[PDB]
Design a protein around this ligand. Structure first.
Ligand SMILES: Nc1nc2c(ncn2[C@@H]2O[C@H](COP(=O)(O)OP(=O)(O)O)[C@@H](O)[C@H]2O)c(=O)[nH]1
Ligand SMILES: [Mg+2]
Length: 178
């Protein structure tokens, strides 16, 4: 056994699924009834490529705007997260969110998460994004937006479906052990 202890702060706009990522990964079941603003005070255990890490998993909001700065220190990994149904949200990833880390977090890893993977091959999205014609975010459009900013790694995922969720945390593990 070991005891590697690593902070992870999840940053981003509203409606990416921050807290549905933070919860679901904990409990392994989507909050279908009610979800808070923020869900904090959580540790994941991840036994990955040999090493066992205690990956502490924090969060942020905006509703608590003046709390983003209080949560940045000691970060061993940032989860900057966007939502594929709000490509307007990848538009903030370069203005704000990256402009904030390199103030409250000089260096520090970033792993780009692209949530709401489900609202991509949907009707009501292709019917609404496409009503402002905004074709839901494609993979290589993100993947390479993550290269620009610095993301040692790229991820997308769903928390309704739960496919990816562990890798969005496991890839971070390695990211805090790199
Ligand atoms: N379709 C879909 N909706 C999601 C998913 N994850 C979260 N949501 C929606 O996002 C809502 C709230 O987003 P939340 O997790 O609070 O975002 P935050 O403000 O960024 O922390 C949930 O109540 C769901 O309606 C997902 O994987 N797929
Ligand atoms: Mg929430």
């Amino acid at each position: 056994m070991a005891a590697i202890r690593k902070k992870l702060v999840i940053v981003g706009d509203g409606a990416c699924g921050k807290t549905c990522l933070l919860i679901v990964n904990s409990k392994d079941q989507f909050p279908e009834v009610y979800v808070p603003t923020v869900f904090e005070n959580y540790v994941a255990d991840i036994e990955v490529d040999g090493k066992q890490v205690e990956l502490a998993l924090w969060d942020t909001a905006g509703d608590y705007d003046r709390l983003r700065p209080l949560s940045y220190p000691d970060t061993d990994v940032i989860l900057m997260c966007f939502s594929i149904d709000s490509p307007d949200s990848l538009e903030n990833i370069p203005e704000k969110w990256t402009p904030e880390v390199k103030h409250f977090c000089p260096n520090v890893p970033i792993i780009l998460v692209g949530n709401k993977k489900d609202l991509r091959n949907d009707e009501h999205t292709r019917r609404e994004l496409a009503k402002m014609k905004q074709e839901p975010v494609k993979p290589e459009e993100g993947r390479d937006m993550a290269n620009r900013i610095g993301a040692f790694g790229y991820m997308e995922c769903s928390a309704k479906t739960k496919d990816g969720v562990r890798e969005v945390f496991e890839m971070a593990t390695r990211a805090a052990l790199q």
